[PDB]
Amino acid sequence: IKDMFSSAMEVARFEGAQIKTVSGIRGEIKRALSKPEGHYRAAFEDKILMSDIVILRSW
């Protein structure tokens, strides 16, 4: 997942959070990728598409 964070520190702050696509596919962020900074690895209920947007509902 590309750009909801600006740094791996930010993703480290937000690890384990539950996200979802706009299709309601639930998911969880797992680990920040190393070289592209705000990019991370998430796991979903099944295969999401390239035309989706993930969402971290915070308050």
């Binding site: 299709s23 035309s51 989706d52 947007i53």
Partner: peptide, 10 residues
């Protein structure tokens, strides 16, 4: 990436 798909499409 045309057409943001929603829950009926999924």
């Amino acid at each position: 990436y045309g057409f943001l798909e929603k829950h009926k499409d999924y």
